Amino acid sequence: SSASVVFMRFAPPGEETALPPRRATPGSVAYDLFPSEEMDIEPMGLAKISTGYGIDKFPDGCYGQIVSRSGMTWKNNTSVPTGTIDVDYRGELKVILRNHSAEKSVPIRKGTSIAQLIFLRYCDVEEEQIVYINETTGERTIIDSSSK
Amino acid sequence: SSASVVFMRFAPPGEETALPPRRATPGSVAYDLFPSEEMDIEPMGLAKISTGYGIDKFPDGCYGQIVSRSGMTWKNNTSVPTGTIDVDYRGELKVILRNHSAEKSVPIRKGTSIAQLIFLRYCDVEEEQIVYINETTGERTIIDSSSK
Amino acid sequence: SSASVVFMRFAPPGEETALPPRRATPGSVAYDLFPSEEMDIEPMGLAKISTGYGIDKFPDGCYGQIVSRSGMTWKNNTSVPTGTIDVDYRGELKVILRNHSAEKSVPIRKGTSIAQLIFLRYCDVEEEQIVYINETTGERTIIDSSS
Numbered sequence A, B: 001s002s003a004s005v006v007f008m009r010f011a012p013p014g015e016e017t018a019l020p021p022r023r024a025t026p027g028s029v030a031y032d033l034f035p036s037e038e039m040d041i042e043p044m045g046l047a048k049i050s051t052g053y054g055i056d057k058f059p060d061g062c063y064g065q066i067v068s069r070s071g072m073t074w075k076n077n078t079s080v081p082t083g084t085i086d087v088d089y090r091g092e093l094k095v096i097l098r099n100h101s102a103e104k105s106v107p108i109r110k111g112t113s114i115a116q117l118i119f120l121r122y123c124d125v126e127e128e129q130i131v132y133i134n135e136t137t138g139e140r141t142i143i144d145s146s147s148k
Numbered sequence C: 001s002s003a004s005v006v007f008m009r010f011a012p013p014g015e016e017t018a019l020p021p022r023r024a025t026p027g028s029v030a031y032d033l034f035p036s037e038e039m040d041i042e043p044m045g046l047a048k049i050s051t052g053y054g055i056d057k058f059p060d061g062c063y064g065q066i067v068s069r070s071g072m073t074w075k076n077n078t079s080v081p082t083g084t085i086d087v088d089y090r091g092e093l094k095v096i097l098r099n100h101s102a103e104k105s106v107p108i109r110k111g112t113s114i115a116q117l118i119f120l121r122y123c124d125v126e127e128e129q130i131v132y133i134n135e136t137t138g139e140r141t142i143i144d145s146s147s
Helices: A070-075 B070-076 C070-076
Strands: A004-009 A031-032 A040-043 A047-048 A053-057 A064-069 A094-099 A107-109 A115-121 A127-132 A140-147 B002-007 B030-033 B040-042 B046-050 B051-056 B062-067 B092-097 B106-109 B115-121 B128-134 B140-145 C004-009 C030-033 C038-043 C046-050 C053-057 C063-069 C094-099 C107-110 C115-121 C128-131 C140-146
Touching: A040 A047, A047 A107, A053 C128, A070 C094, A094 A107, A094 B070, A115 B115, A115 C115, A127 B051, B040 B046, B046 B106, B092 B106, B092 C070, B115 C115, C038 C046, C046 C107, C094 C107
Parallel strands: A004 C128, A127 B002, B128 C004
Antiparallel strands: A004 A053, A031 A115, A040 A107, A047 A094, A064 A115, A127 A140, B002 B051, B030 B115, B040 B106, B046 B092, B062 B115, B128 B140, C004 C053, C030 C115, C038 C107, C046 C094, C063 C115, C128 C140
């Protein structure tokens, strides 16, 4: 279970949907994400693209980070401004994609990947304290504290 | 100590300050960050927003990465262009926020989160080497090496 | 092996190249990257800057993430829109840098860092399964799986 992922398909079986998150090969860090629908992102535009899938099970100690693909960033003048997926998120992954071109539109197509997903190890903090420190004496005052 | 964090409050107790860093849900991988002061980020503007807090103690094997919130990115046409917090950083966390709108200003308000902070596991490299590969033999030549 | 990195220098010894990747302080989580050549990034421009180095060996369970430098971002109105370095990449690291200024050009200079590189712990997925879950009853149907 330590290195296993379960993706949740939103569309009922039998219905046309996006290509599933596909391992990027050659390579080992990313999954390619695909769009459910086709569109053209206008110059300076910001799009929210549905991928047809959610993460049902994350690998242990990992959350998901949606990142831009190098090719499209350079070729289509794009970026992925946000992409932090919490371990409790059950909804459908949606890629936020910005077109930085003042002249060209970005083609979003069924069989072509729009972004990558990486499973990064993070710390799920168990203990937290908020402290105020006297800048002259070094004396500490606990503001508040909590356990998870 | 392995999963514990200590935040340092810059404002004395009883003084006006930003809401403290806080995880919104039990599935939250990131702490929500809040502004100390209210402002309006002009179109195309880049702001450095004070959060009222610093990190006094990091969890073991982790560093702080400030990332954009999805809501704030989509609703206000924003991005967080930088946010690497080194384990030796002793100052107040400041969020760098870009407003991509050519027409609308971004409202920065006291009770509304501007970004989030993740504690990511990184490798604190102990041994490093620069190598040159001889192009006739394939023989590796150590240029330099260092220990931490 | 667990906490060791090997950088590969592309330029021959004796030839002038970029300053090597280096951590600024003992508290640095990232290596400062430097450019092989000098250039000026025009307003609204997107540049692909060669660093003179590649990663020959990654630390165990790590990949390379190129991220923006704080002073460089705030001072020169820049960003690093991409920077995922897969563990199988042996080529030269190239920093993708966007100039957001509509008026000022960005000076790229030999001794000045353009970005930084972090070695982040990731999961190299061994098993993947795509499943359809009924909302009625939590009944699961494996659509596809791979190892």
